[PDB]
Every structure is written in C-alpha cells, then in structure tokens.
Design a protein around this ligand. Structure first.
Ligand SMILES: *CCC(=O)Nc1ccc(OC)c(Nc2cc(-c3[nH]c(SCCOC)nc3-c3ccc(F)cc3)ccn2)c1
Ligand SMILES: *CCC(=O)Nc1ccc(OC)c(Nc2cc(-c3[nH]c(SCCOC)nc3-c3ccc(F)cc3)ccn2)c1
Ligand SMILES: [Cl-]
Ligand SMILES: [Cl-]
Lengths: 314, 302
C-alpha cells in the first residue's frame, strides 16, 4: 500500500539515458518533491509494452508486489508512473551492473569479491523464493552494484508481467534469455524456483569468466539440442573442481536434483572462508576486501542500509 | 580509529561553493574512489587559518572525536585531508541548512515539522552532552536538513579547533568565555526562536556590543507570533542567568515530544490545515531514496 509511490509526470524528469534491455530503457532521472527545489537522482525504467492488453489494475498489483520486497540483496521498486506507458522508479546505483563491473575490473577482482557476490546473489534469490517469487531473468546484467562489496538483484517478475512473443523463443539472440534458461523453460515455458537456480549457475559462470558470453557463437535455436546432448558451459580457468561442480549441479536436467538457494548460500559461504582454496587468481593477496576504515567510509556515504556482514577469510 | 578515513588530495575534487561561515568555506565535492570510475557527491569544508595554529597531532585527535559521534541527529565527520590546509569531508545534504529552509518555506511549514525539529535537535544535543562534548556554536545555520522530516546537527567541535556569534551566546560565555552544556542550552533556545520566527535574525538592528548589557537588564528575544506561551516559556528558561536553572536537553526532548503530539495546540499558524507530515507512502519513498539510516520514529499528532 504505502510501499509504492504513485508519481505524476510533473514531479520527475528523465535526464540521461543509461542503456536498455529486453524489458525497457533505463534513464538517470531527477525527482522533484512537490513544493521543494531540490532535484534528487533516481533511476527510471520506461518499460516496453506488455504482450497482452493487461488491465492497469494488474500492472499496479504486480508493481505493489515488487515494492514489497525487503532484503539487503534485492532492489525494491519505489515508485511507478502510469500514463499511456509504464515507468518504474527506484534508487540509482552509480556503480552500474555487475556484468559491466566484472568486465571492466577483470584484472583487479580477487576471490573474496567473487565468492561473496555468489553468496549475496544466493541470499537475494533465497528471499525471492521465500516470497514465492520466481525471477525468470536472473543474469549478471540484472545484478546491480550498490558498492563493490554489496550487490542487489533487480528486474524480478518483469518477464512474467510483460511476457514475450513466442517468436522470440526461436529468434537469434533476441529478447528471450535462451542461453540462461533451464531446458524445461526453453521447451515448455516452465518457470520455477529451480529454473531460477539454473540461471543462477549461469550467472556464477559469467562472474567467474569476468563477463564472457555463455555459449558464444552457438545459435539460440540450437541450445535446447546441445543441452539434451549433455553439453554444458566450460570450466572457467580460475575455478577449482569444487566450484565448477556446483555450477554443473545447477544445470541438471532433473530440476529437483539442482541445489536449493538456501544450500548455495551455505556452500559459497564456506568457500569464502578459505577463498584461495577454491579460486586460483594470480595476485590474489593484493585484492582483499576493504579495510574497516574504507568499509565504514563507503557505508556512511553510499550504503546506510543494514546488511549481513561479508564473509572474510579465516 | 577506523571511523576516520584520511584522504589524498587526488581522490576528491571541489566542484561548487555551497556557502561559507566563520570556520571556512563549504564545497560540494566529488569523491573518486581509486581504481573506480564513479564520482560520489560529498560536502567539503576547507577551514580558514586557525587563530593560533594547532599541532597536526592535535587536529587529528579532535578529528577522531568528531568521527566518533554516532547519533541520527548529529552529523558524523567521515574523512579528513591534512595538507597545507585542513579539509573535512561529510555526507552531502542536498536540502541544505535548516535556517535557509525555514526562510524559503516561511509560508508553507506546518506546526508538526517545527515541533519535531525541536525534538530532533534536542536529541542530538542530549547525545553530545552524554559524550561530555560541548558544541559552542549551535544555531539554525548549523542544523542540516537530510530530509524535511530528519535534521542533524553539524559543526560540532569546530569552535575550539579554531566571527563570534554573540547573539546566540549565553551571558557567561560573552563575559568570561565559559562554555558548557548549559550554555549550549542557551543557544538551543535561540535556535528554536529562529525556527519559530521562520528564520528571523535575533536582536535585529541591535549592535552586538550592546547584547550583554541588554541581557543583564533582563530583556530577551520576544514571543514569536506563532508561539503559545508553553513554547515561549521554554525559550525563556533557556536564557536564565543561572546556568543550572536552564532546562536539560533530556527534559526538552520530553516537552517538545508532548507538544508534537498535539501540535496545533502549541503553535498557532495561519492555515495550519494547509500542511502536515508526509504520509507513510511519502516517508517510505524519502527513506529508501536518500535516508536509509536508523532513526527514531516521528512524533505525529493525536
Ligand atoms: C547491466 C547494465 C547496467 O545496468 N548499467 C548501468 C550503467 C550506469 C548506471 O548508473 C550510473 C546504472 N545504474 C542503475 C541501473 C538500474 C537498472 N539496470 C537495468 S538493466 C537494463 C539497462 O540498464 C541500463 N535495469 C534497471 C532498473 C530496474 C527497475 C527500475 F525501476 C529502474 C531501473 C537500476 C538502478 N541503478 C546501471
Ligand atoms: C545554512 C547554510 C548552508 O549550509 N547551506 C547549504 C546549501 C546547499 C547544500 O548542498 C546542496 C548544503 N549541504 C551541506 C552543508 C554542510 C555544511 N554546512 C555547514 S554551515 C556553513 C555554510 O555551509 C554551506 N558546514 C558544513 C560542513 C561541516 C563539516 C564537513 F566535513 C563538510 C561540510 C555539510 C553537508 N551538506 C548546505
Ligand atoms: Cl531490461
Ligand atoms: Cl562555518
């Protein structure tokens, strides 16, 4: 109720485009509180139109759910503007998304960061599962960096809200994330918490390869066939067999043989307590988590919300 | 202590002057974390030359104390840059200071905000008193607006670290340069008077050289147009000659909180039905966007 603010077009302005995805276009924006003269930075997403003529009441009902999430590793929807088109407002994250972050910092990222990101994403997804919410598009592009030590999931439930034309399930690298999807989602549009776990495994692979594209060069139309033949994403060079095995379990054909997010939290938390045993990165001792001084400073400036302590090495 | 980050000159940049005061110039700045590509707004105060220069070790010791304050209504010093000058770094407050805010909103501020600001300032000062820290320069200009519903005291400790606010000062501070928690209570009374007059200058048109004589005669700032006598008697007790006759900050929290529960009974403002606190919807939006720290609940009406 009081969790989702209904904005008028007169009280916010899109300022500079930041990029787009299958769900819409994202802008850095400014919120102007009524009667005030300050301009408050916000992130605004102008959504693509839904594949069906959904009642506005169901868009609002779905947005109320998105505004109801309360977890340090899930981005809460803060506001909505409904005109002819739908616009979503949330907190702006200046560090951008984790996919861009690992690509741009590939030679500066140590094992402690990689393993803690895996923990935090699993915690966010476990919260979504506890709320009975299936994400449907978990990917590194949909994990946002609040600080380098604090990541948060976004864009959950948008695939279910906006839908996708079935032509896109057979197009070449279109709006349907075929190469992140469980086989049962590709074949029968079956979406469950356990198919989210499949996408979690692909997300981890993106991180451990510092943002490589999964199944690069393979047509989207052939993915279901190569998956049925038992082919999977390769072992990243920095991953020990323990880490790769977790990823491989995420991609089992039988969905209920895959790990659960609550188990993934525990296993990645265990590895983070001895990070150099599970990931092999040249120069890893240069790339520790921030000092208490730097962490205190980061949190006071940019990240005052509560969060579980990161897992340090033993 | 890990509460104070010492910054290099090369990792931040001043981009605009926001204002100035007796202690230095305030800039909006951008913090550039090393190896990152983001620029994070900050507020930077470059201090002027101290009257008698202090040893670097002593500047650091006082900075560590300033970084040690942990209360929702006191601004914590976050970092320092010690070179040929002293530059203090804190979180930027885009709403600015409360003095400018009440002046800009002279025709739009409701009684619930005014009384709640009095509560929050008293809570911050009570915290400083518990830490045995004297502010020495409490004034509406040194109260910052994080959101309209959440204000915070700033500039603690600068006065002794380093153009004298005679019209905010207790008589014993004017006469004998004595500064205590009870002389902070005097300045709190002047600060409340500033808020309730929507930012009027105290003793306007009266030379500062005459203030101590006027106080000794028993004259004080007048009852603000909107204040019932309940509120004005609190102010007058703040300005008693006997420092131990003045109220305690702990008591001021209780009294203003009681009044904030029935605000239109204690402040009489034209069209007060115009204005009021944000709904839970607008408060959740403000908090999630720019005020995620833990804070005591607002005092709402009946
Ligand atoms: C992975 C690509 C990306 O997000 N880059 C990026 C670059 C610069 C930024 O700020 C300086 C941000 N900050 C940000 C982004 C989002 C967000 N990102 C996406 S992915 C599609 C293309 O985005 C560029 N969607 C959102 C979003 C979801 C819901 C909503 F209500 C608003 C935006 C959110 C917050 N901050 C990212
Ligand atoms: C009452 C005058 C005022 O503060 N105006 C003002 C205008 C615009 C702002 O941001 C857009 C801010 N924000 C702010 C100010 C300060 C701060 N204010 C002062 S009072 C002297 C005049 O300053 C403008 N001192 C400070 C300060 C103290 C310590 C430090 F380390 C940095 C700054 C702090 C944060 N945000 C204010
Ligand atoms: Cl998108
Ligand atoms: Cl100043």
């Amino acid at each position: 109720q009081a969790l989702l603010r209904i904005l008028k077009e007169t009280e916010f302005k899109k300022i500079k485009v930041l990029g787009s995805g299958a769900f819409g276009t994202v802008y850095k924006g400014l919120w102007i509180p009524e009667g005030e003269k300050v301009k408050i930075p916000v992130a605004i997403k102008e959504l693509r139109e839904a594949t069906s003529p959904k009642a506005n009441k169901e868009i609002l009902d779905e947005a109320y759910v998105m505004a109801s999430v309360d977890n340090p590793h899930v981005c809460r929807l803060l506001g909505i503007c409904l005109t002819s088109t739908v616009q979503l407002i949330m907190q702006l994250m200046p560090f951008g998304c984790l996919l861009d972050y690992v690509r741009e910092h590939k030679d500066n990222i140590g094992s402690q960061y990689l393993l803690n990101w895996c923990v935090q994403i699993a915690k966010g997804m476990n919260y979504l599962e506890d709320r009975r919410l299936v994400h449907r598009d978990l990917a590194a592009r949909n994990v946002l960096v609040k600080t380098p030590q604090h990541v948060k999931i976004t864009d959950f439930g948008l695939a279910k809200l906006l839908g996708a034309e079935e032509k896109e399930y057979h197009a070449e690298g279109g709006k349907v994330p075929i190469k992140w999807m469980a086989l049962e989602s590709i074949l029968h549009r079956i979406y469950t918490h356990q198919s989210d776990v499949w996408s979690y495994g692909v997300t981890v692979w993106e991180l451990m390869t510092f943002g490589s594209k999964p199944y690069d060069g393979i047509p989207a139309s052939e993915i279901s066939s190569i998956l049925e033949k038992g082919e999977r994403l390769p072992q990243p060079p920095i991953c020990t067999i323990d880490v790769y095995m977790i990823m491989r379990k995420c991609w089992m054909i039988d969905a209920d043989s895959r790990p659960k997010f609550r188990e993934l939290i525990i296993e990645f938390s265990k590895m983070a307590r001895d990070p150099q045993r599970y990931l092999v990165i040249q120069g890893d001792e240069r790339m520790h988590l921030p000092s208490p001084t730097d962490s205190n400073f980061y949190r006071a400036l940019m990240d005052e919300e509560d969060m579980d302590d990161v897992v340090d090495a033993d």
